[PDB]
Amino acid sequence: GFGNGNGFG
Amino acid sequence: GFGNGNGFG
Amino acid sequence: GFGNGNGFG
Amino acid sequence: GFGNGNGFG
Amino acid sequence: GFGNGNGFG
Amino acid sequence: GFGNGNGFG
Amino acid sequence: GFGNGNGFG
Amino acid sequence: GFGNGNGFG
Amino acid sequence: GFGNGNGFG
Amino acid sequence: GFGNGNGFG
Amino acid sequence: GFGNGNGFG
Amino acid sequence: GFGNGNGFG
Amino acid sequence: GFGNGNGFG
Amino acid sequence: GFGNGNGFG
Amino acid sequence: GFGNGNGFG
Amino acid sequence: GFGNGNGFG
Amino acid sequence: GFGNGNGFG
Amino acid sequence: GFGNGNGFG
Amino acid sequence: GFGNGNGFG
Amino acid sequence: GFGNGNGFG
Amino acid sequence: GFGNGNGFG
Amino acid sequence: GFGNGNGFG
């Protein structure tokens, strides 16, 4: 899955 | 100063 | 910080 | 049934 | 996206 | 003043 | 990465 | 008479 | 079915 | 932006 | 859908 | 200042 | 949509 | 534009 | 049957 | 300092 | 797993 | 002075 | 951050 | 007599 | 675990 | 933290 903070670009 | 949502672990 | 499958048990 | 830690990937 | 003060034109 | 968009970073 | 008809055993 | 988990798109 | 990229335009 | 079809991961 | 830098002259 | 349509970012 | 003749079993 | 007949999948 | 007191982080 | 699992002797 | 003091960048 | 990375020792 | 007195201009 | 960058150390 | 009088400053 | 009194000026 994905971690705490997510920004894609 | 940083980008979109960041992973401060 | 940890991956998908994690079973301390 | 299963084991202790089953991360469905 | 865009960060601190901005200048293309 | 500076030129356009001179962000002190 | 799922597709249809995945009923976990 | 179906198996564990299957679904027809 | 389709997966997540579903913009035909 | 980029595409109308936008599905990540 | 028109991309970013279009500008019909 | 330059083309009829200008699209920034 | 589907092919006219279809036996699911 | 779009052609005469089209059958997304 | 284990350490006096443990931690996993 | 100490963090987390410090079951003391 | 961090020291008593951290100001995160 | 000091950046906020200050808990001591 | 920076030193307490700041002047870039 | 100086600019405004005056921290006094 | 440190001394009698400290100058935290 | 700067010894005796300084007539800053």
What does this entry list as its resolution, in Å? 3.8
DSSP state for residue E4 in the 8-state scheme: S
Rounded Cα distance between Q3 and A4, Å, is 20
Rounded Cα distance between G9 and D1, Å, is 9
Interchain pair A7, B6: CB under 8 A = yes
Chains with ≥3 Cβ pairs under 8 A against Q? P, R
- Show Cβ contacts of residue C9 under 8 Å, excluding neighbours closer than 6 positions: D3, D4, D5
- Q8: region left, alpha or beta (phi > 0 left; psi from -120 to 50 alpha): left
Nearest to I1 by CA among A1, G3, O8: G3
Exp. method: cryo-EM
Nearest to L3 by CA among E9, J2, E5: E9
Interchain pair T5, S4: CB under 8 A = no
Instruction: Specify the amino acid at residue R7.
Output: G
Give chain J positions within 8 Å (CB) of I5. Answer: 5-7
CA T1 to chain centroid: 9
